[PDB]
Every structure is written in structure tokens, then in C-alpha cells.
Amino acid sequence: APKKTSFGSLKDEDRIFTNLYGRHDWRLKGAQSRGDWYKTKEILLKGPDWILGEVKTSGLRGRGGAGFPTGLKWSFMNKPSDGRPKYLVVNADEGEPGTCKDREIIRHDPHKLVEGCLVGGRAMGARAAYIYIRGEFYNEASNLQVAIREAYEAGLIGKNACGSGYDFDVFVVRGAGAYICGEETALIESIEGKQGKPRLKPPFPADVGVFGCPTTVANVETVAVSPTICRRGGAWFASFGRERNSGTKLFNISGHVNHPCTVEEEMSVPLKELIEKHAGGVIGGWDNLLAVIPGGSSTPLIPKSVCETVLMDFDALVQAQTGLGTAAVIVMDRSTDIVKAIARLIEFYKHESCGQCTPCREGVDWMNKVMARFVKGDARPAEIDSLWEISKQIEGHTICALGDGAAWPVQGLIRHFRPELEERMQQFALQHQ
Amino acid sequence: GAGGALFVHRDTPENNPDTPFDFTPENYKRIEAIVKNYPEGHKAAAVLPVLDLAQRQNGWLPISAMNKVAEILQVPPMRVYEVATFYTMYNRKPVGKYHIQVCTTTPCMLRNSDSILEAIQKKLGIKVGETTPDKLFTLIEVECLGACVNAPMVQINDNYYEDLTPKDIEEIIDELKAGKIPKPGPRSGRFSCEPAGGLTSLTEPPKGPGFGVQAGL
Amino acid sequence: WSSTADPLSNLVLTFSTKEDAVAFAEKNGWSFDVEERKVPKPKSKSYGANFSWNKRTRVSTK
Numbered sequence: 010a011p012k013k014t015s016f017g018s019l020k021d022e023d024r025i026f027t028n029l030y031g032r033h034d035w036r037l038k039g040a041q042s043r044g045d046w047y048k049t050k051e052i053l054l055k056g057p058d059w060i061l062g063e064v065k066t067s068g069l070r071g072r073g074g075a076g077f078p079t080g081l082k083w084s085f086m087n088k089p090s091d092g093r094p095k096y097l098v099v100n101a102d103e104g105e106p107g108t109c110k111d112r113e114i115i116r117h118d119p120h121k122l123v124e125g126c127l128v129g130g131r132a133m134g135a136r137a138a139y140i141y142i143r144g145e146f147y148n149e150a151s152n153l154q155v156a157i158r159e160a161y162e163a164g165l166i167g168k169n170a171c172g173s174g175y176d177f178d179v180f181v182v183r184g185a186g187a188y189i190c191g192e193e194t195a196l197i198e199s200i201e202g203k204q205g206k207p208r209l210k211p212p213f214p215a216d217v218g219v220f221g222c223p224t225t226v227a228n229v230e231t232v233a234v235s236p237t238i239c240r241r242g243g244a245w246f247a248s249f250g251r252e253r254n255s256g257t258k259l260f261n262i263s264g265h266v267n268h269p270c271t272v273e274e275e276m277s278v279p280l281k282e283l284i285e286k287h288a289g290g291v292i293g294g295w296d297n298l299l300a301v302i303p304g305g306s307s308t309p310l311i312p313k314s315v316c317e318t319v320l321m322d323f324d325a326l327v328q329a330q331t332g333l334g335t336a337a338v339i340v341m342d343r344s345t346d347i348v349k350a351i352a353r354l355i356e357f358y359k360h361e362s363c364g365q366c367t368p369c370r371e372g373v374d375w376m377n378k379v380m381a382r383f384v385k386g387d388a389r390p391a392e393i394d395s396l397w398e399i400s401k402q403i404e405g406h407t408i409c410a411l412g413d414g415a416a417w418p419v420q421g422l423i424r425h426f427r428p429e430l431e432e433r434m435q436q437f438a439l440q441h442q
Numbered sequence: 443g444a445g446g447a448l449f450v451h452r453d454t455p456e457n458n459p460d461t462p463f464d465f466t467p468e469n470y471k472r473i474e475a476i477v478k479n480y481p482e483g484h485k486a487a488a489v490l491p492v493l494d495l496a497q498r499q500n501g502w503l504p505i506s507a508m509n510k511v512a513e514i515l516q517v518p519p520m521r522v523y524e525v526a527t528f529y530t531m532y533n534r535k536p537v538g539k540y541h542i543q544v545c546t547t548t549p550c551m552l553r554n555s556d557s558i559l560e561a562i563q564k565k566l567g568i569k570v571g572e573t574t575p576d577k578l579f580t581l582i583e584v585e586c587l588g589a590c591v592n593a594p595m596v597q598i599n600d601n602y603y604e605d606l607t608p609k610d611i612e613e614i615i616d617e618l619k620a621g622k623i624p625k626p627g628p629r630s631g632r633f634s635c636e637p638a639g640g641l642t643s644l645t646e647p648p649k650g651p652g653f654g655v656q657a658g659l
Numbered sequence: 660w661s662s663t664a665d666p667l668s669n670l671v672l673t674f675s676t677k678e679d680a681v682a683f684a685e686k687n688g689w690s691f692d693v694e695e696r697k698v699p700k701p702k703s704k705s706y707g708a709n710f711s712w713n714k715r716t717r718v719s720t721k
């Protein structure tokens with residue numbers, strides 16, 4: 010029967026990332042026997058239109074955090090050639106606090122990523138794939154290079170790439186410690202040998218991207234699932250999760266949980282089931298839970314009142330006023346300082362701003378100072394509303410979406426934990442007068 | 443708090459434009475290989491790796507290294523200065539042989555990262571910005587390293603050491619001092635991103651190739 | 660101090676159009692020099708040109 014209602018119990022027969030835990034050969038031979046690099050020539054020979062259609066039918070949404078529909082976004086490069094080469098860029102930066110999915114995909118299933126690069130480049134008509142990986146992921150990048158080497162030797166990429174007739178290259182470029190370089194345009198700038206400063210849009214990368222050429226930026230998770238969706242088909246991938254929330258998803262459950270880990274799960278699984286089944290629940294019981302950040306630091310946190318009934322997909326968490334983000338659940342129990350955690354996140358954002366645009370460069374540092382004073386209680390209640398307005402000024406007025414990610418956790422803390430702030434201010438005034 | 447590092451350069455007898463720096467011939471072969479990846483006429487794109495390569499041979503980046511990279515790639519030196527001061531992995535000052543980077547962001551802090559930081563400080567006798575007098579270690583704090591599930595974690599010269607405890611961090615320091623190298627990864631009998639006990643999923647044998655393939659392919 | 664003997668050294672008149680200024684000067688009997696208004700020419704701006712694939716316009720910094 011269609012339109013399921015209780016998502017969140019899928020067996021290992023339907024998991025794309027079968028070597029998530031690295032319990033199986035991470036090299037090619039392993040991948041080959043696990044289903045990787047299968048019927049690639051057939052998929053390539055089906056053409057870009059067929060490949061684009063499969064992505065579209067699946068309903069695949071961008072796993073990098075924004076959730077833009079993947080098929081429509083990849084169809085933006087279906088234009089005829091204009092003399093410029095076309096490129097696919099894989100975003101392997103993984104800078105979001107709480108997020109470790111791309112690291113595991115790269116280190117334990119690199120051939121999935123390489124095949125995803127090949128199929129995505131064929132769909133876009135791209136000439137080569139640049140994989141921008143985090144600089145701190147030295148061993149992951151080296152495993153990726155070993156995988157690309159054994160794919161080149163076996164003729165799975167390079168000239169003709171198959172019995173296919175299509176030439177495709179895969180390059181790995183390492184960053185040097187910059188979270189802002191996860192942004193697609195800032196990533197493009199960092200590939201071209203500049204500071205990782207985001208561009209303004211328009212133009213979008215499909216018009217003017219890397220080296221000024223048409224480019225498509227795709228998250229590692231989005232790229233990896235691309236070949237499994239093609240062989241399995243769009244209809245199969247969709248058969249999971251609610252409407253407009255199709256497919257499976259990697260979740261990183263960390264913080265105050267008994268067994269922090271990462272796990273593949275159906276999209277619309279309830280948060281409570283995910284936390285209590287895979288992560289072993291909250292230390293101190295479920296009633297010890299204080300707050301949850303469902304999608305990495307860039308998303309507003311939610312209190313226990315919402316966490317017990319919210320689904321883990323895009324629209325459900327949007328209705329909870331937070332957002333799915335990178336599907337990186339950070340759990341905080343009743344034993345933590347909720348203001349201190351948000352202050353640390355704001356300090357991270359202050360240290361990660363590129364400084365290009367005025368609202369981010371000035372207001373995030375301003376919010377950091379205000380939040381550090383809030384932690385002690387130095388402030389007055391009239392500043393809390395003031396702080397709210399500061400965030401509003403920052404949000405939607407910056408080039409880059411780092412300003413949004415800095416302003417949203419503060420808004421969440423003020424929306425849900427204002428009384429704690431006020432009582433901290435009252436206490437500081439009481440013992441200071 | 444504040445960065446602490448200055449973003450101007452003042453010449454010193456140990457760091458001036460005449461400080462001796464040059465790539466090894468092997469590093470020149472690697473530079474040629476790095477340059478080839480990018481499209482012709484876009485040679486600058488190699489500023490990020492080649493600069494890193496310099497730091498991998500010298501240990502840090504003297505101003506002469508930046509000048510050499512700028513001259514090799516025919517990029518104006520101020521562009522290389524911009525790249526060097528923007529990215530935090532570039533060392534514009536000498537560091538110890540072992541660069542200890544402990545994560546203190548919120549997911550990593552929630553699992554008692556301060557215990558690790560204090561344990562390192564009391565084991566080495568130095569603070570969160572200083573270098574040990576033997577010039578072997580340098581301790582700093584860093585933002586999220588992407589190993590949050592394994593928090594508390596530390597990064598040392600390209601090796602992650604995760605699921606740390608005060609006793610665990612100290613032993614790694616002991617092993618690094620006595621002239622040995624410690625094995626990277628979790629230090630709690632986990633060796634993965636798996637749940638700490640039970641392996642809630644991925645227990646079935648992996649499916650064979652072509653198992654779920656759709657008709658007409 | 661700065662001394663002057665010119666009574667018109669400070670006088671500035673504002674007019675809507677050059678024709679009004681010319682008419683005023685003519686009816687007051689002053690020899691005049693007129694200069695045509697100089698406007699900045701319309702310039703073709705393009706942000707994307709900063710990242711040209713093969714053009715010289717590409718920015719070396721940002």
C-alpha cells in the first residue's frame with residue numbers, strides 16, 4: 010500500500026553505503042563484489058537524458074544541506090557546448106560541526122564516489138571531475154587517490170573510461186583548513202588559487218563556474234548515491250521517505266548519547282526512534298534530554314517538547330522552525346549549559362567568517378561578544394531583544410549563507426531558552442549589584 | 443578568543459627574503475605533476491598545493507618560500523601572501539616536530555574535550571599556544587575536525603586520535619616522545635564510526651552485484 | 660588676514676538651466692563664458708566578467 014506513515018525501519022538490503030563501518034575491503038576488488046562499478050557502460054550508453062531522468066524521478070535532494078532538488082540542478086548543464094570545457098566539482102569539505110558522513114564515504118567507499126563522479130559528469134556532459142577534499146583529511150584523500158589509481162589502471166576512468174567512448178578525468182584537490190571553502194563559490198575560488206571568498210549569484214556555477222567554465226557542485230553523498238539510483242532506478246529510491254523527502258540518509262548522532270555513531274536510515278524516521286535505537290538513547294534516559302540540534306550547528310536547536318514527535322526530513326523540521334541541514338544530530342542533556350554551547354558555536358562562526366562582506370564580518374564578531382557576555386550574565390534583559398534584531402540584520406543581507414548559519418542558532422536559543430538567559434542575568438546582578 | 447597571530451610580516455635574521463629556501467628535485471617533479479592537472483593559462487590554481495608542498499619540505503613557510511612559489515608559478519607575491527594568511531593550516535612561524543591540534547567545538551566539547559586539553563597541558567608543561575622547549579610539541583585548539591562522533595579527538599601531523607581519555611592522550615604523548623609512532627583511530631575498542639556496542643545495522647552479508655538492477659539495463 | 664577689494668568675490672548664483680543663466684548675465688550686462696554640462700558616460704558593468712575563462716578581465720584577487 011502506498012503513502013506509508015511509519016518510516017524508519019529499513020534493513021541492510023536497501024542501504025546504499027554497505028561499507029559504512031569499513032568492515033569490508035575498501036579497495037576496488039571489494040567494491041566490485043559489493044555491487045560497485047556494475048553496468049557503468051550501459052548507464053553511460055543510456056545517455057545524459059536518461060541519467061538526468063532517473064535523478065529527477067527519484068526526487069533526490071541535495072545532501073549537502075540545502076536540499077535543492079538534484080535532478081533539476083543537474084539539468085542546468087544540459088545546454089550544448091559553447092567552446093568552454095565543462096566540469097563537475099565534488100564538495101568533500103565537510104566543515105559543519107557534528108557532521109562526519111562524507112569522511113566515512115571517502116575513506117570506506119571511495120569507488121562509490123568515483124563511479125558517482127563518472128555518472129554525474131556523463132549526465133552533465135562534463136569533461137572531468139575535481140574532488141575538493143578537506144585538508145585535514147589526509148588519509149581519506151590518500152585512500153581516495155589509491156581508489157582513483159586502481160580505477161585508472163582497470164580502465165574504469167580516463168580515456169574511454171569503459172567500453173563506452175567517453176573520456177573522463179578525476180582530480181583530487183586538497184583544501185587548507187577553511188570551513189568557508191565548503192560553500193560552492195568559495196570552493197571554486199579556492200580551487201583557482203585564491204582566498205576562499207564566496208562569489209555573488211548570479212552568475213550561477215552552471216553559467217560561470219571554475220576557471221570561468223560551466224560547473225556543477227555536488228555533495229559527496231549526493232554524488233555517491235547517483236549510480237545506485239541509476240541501476241536500481243528512480244522509482245525505487247523514491248519508495249522511501251515522505252513525499253518530497255525521498256530516499257535514505259546518513260545521520261551523525263553525537264553529543265549526549267550513549268553510543269554516538271553514524272548510521273544510514275530512512276529519510277522520514279522520527280527523531281526519537283533514531284536516537285533511542287541506533288545511538289542508545291540519551292545518557293540519563295530520554296527524560297534527561299534538554300535540547301537537540303538536528304542538522305549541524307547551522308540549524309536552530311529544538312527543545313524536548315518538539316523532539317519527541319518531529320520527523321527527520323526537510324519539510325517536517327522546517328515546520329518545527331529548525332531545518333534538516335546536514336542531518337547531524339547533536340544531543341544535549343539536562344546536565345549541560347545551553348547558553349555555553351550556543352556561545353561556542355557563535356565563536357566557531359566568528360573564527361570561520363571569510364570577512365568579505367560587512368554584515369557577516371562585523372555582526373558575527375559583535376554577536377560573539379554579546380554571547381560571551383550572556384554566558385556570564387553581564388548583560389541586561391533589554392539586550393536580548395537587541396541581540397535578536399542584530400541577527401535579523403545579519404540574516405539575508407550577506408553574500409554567503411554563513412551569516413544565516415551564524416544568526417539561526419542565536420535565534421533558536423532566544424526563541425526557546427529566554428528564561429534561562431534572564432535568570433542568569435538576574436543572578437549576576439544579585440551577586441554583583 | 444582573539445587570534446594572537448599577526449598578519450603583517452617584519453623581517454628577522456631567521457625569516458627574511460634572503461632566508462635559504464629551494465625545492466628538492468623530487469619536489470620539482472611533484473610540482474610539475476601538480477601543475478599539469480589544471481587547464482593551460484590557469485597555472486595559479488596550483489598556489490594552494492605547491493605552497494603546502496613547500497611547508498611539507500621545510501616544516502613552515504618562511505617569506506622566502508612564498509617568494510619562491512610566487513616566482514615558480516609567475517603569480518604576484520601578494521597573491522601568495524593572501525593565500526598564506528587566509529588558510530589556517532599554513533605555518534608562517536616554526537612549529538614543533540609534532541603539532542597537536544585538539545578540537546574544542548560544541549559536539550567535541552560536550553564529550554569533555556577540556557579534560558583532554560588540561561591533560562595535555564599538565565603532561566607537557568605548556569599552554570594552548572606555546573611550543574615545548576625541546577621543540578618537539580606545539581599545542582593549539584582548533585574548530586570542528588569532522589570527527590565529532592569520535593569526540594574527544596586530537597589531530598597530530600595528519601593522524602587522527604579519537605575517543606580520547608586523559609590516560610589515553612598521555613600515553614600517545616609518551617609513545618611519540620620515545621621515538622615511536624602511535625596507531626591512529628579510536629582508542630576505545632571501536633576502530634570505526636560504529637556504535638560502541640551492538641552494531642545496530644550493517645550486519646547482513648553484503649549483496650552481490652546486480653541484485654537490485656531495474657529491468658531494461 | 661586675507662584682504663580683498665573685490666565686492667563680487669563671494670557671489671554665486673543658481674539657475675535651473677543654462678538659458679536662464681545666459682539671459683540673466685545678458686540683461687545684467689556681464690561678459691560670460693558658458694561650459695556645456697559634462698555627464699558621466701553609461702558604462703557596461705558585469706560581475707561575471709571578473710571570472711572570465713579566457714579574458715584579461717579576470718580578477719587576481721577578491
Ligand SMILES: NC(=O)C1=CN([C@@H]2O[C@H](COP(=O)(O)OP(=O)(O)OC[C@H]3O[C@@H](n4cnc5c(N)ncnc54)[C@H](O)[C@@H]3O)[C@@H](O)[C@H]2O)C=CC1
Nearest residue numbers: 073074075077103104105108191193213226307334335410
Ligand atoms: N555539508 C556541510 O558540511 C555543510 C553544509 N551546510 C549547508 O549548506 C546550506 C546552504 O547552502 P547554499 O548553497 O547557500 O543554499 P542554496 O539554496 O542557495 O543553494 C544550494 C544549491 O542549490 C543551487 N541553486 C540554488 N538556486 C539555484 C538556481 N536558481 N539556479 C541554479 N542553481 C541553484 C545552488 O547553486 C547550490 O548548488 C545550508 O542549509 C547548510 O546546512 C553548511 C555548512 C557545512
Ligand SMILES: Cc1cc2nc3c(=O)[nH]c(=O)nc-3n(C[C@H](O)[C@H](O)[C@H](O)COP(=O)(O)O)c2cc1C
Nearest residue numbers: 071072073100102103104191192227228231410411
Ligand atoms: C559556509 C558554508 C559551508 C558549506 N560547507 C559545505 C560542505 O562542507 N560540504 C557540502 O557538501 N556543502 C557545503 N555547503 C553547502 C553547499 O552550498 C552545497 O554543497 C552546494 O550547494 C551543493 O550541495 P548539494 O549537492 O547538497 O546540492 C556549505 C555552505 C555554506 C554556506
Ligand code: SF4
Nearest residue numbers: 363366369409411412
Ligand atoms: S556571509 Fe560571512 S563567510 Fe559568507 S561571504 Fe559574507 S563574510 Fe564571507
Ligand code: FES
Nearest residue numbers: 545550587589590
Ligand atoms: S566538534 Fe570535534 S571533531 Fe567535530
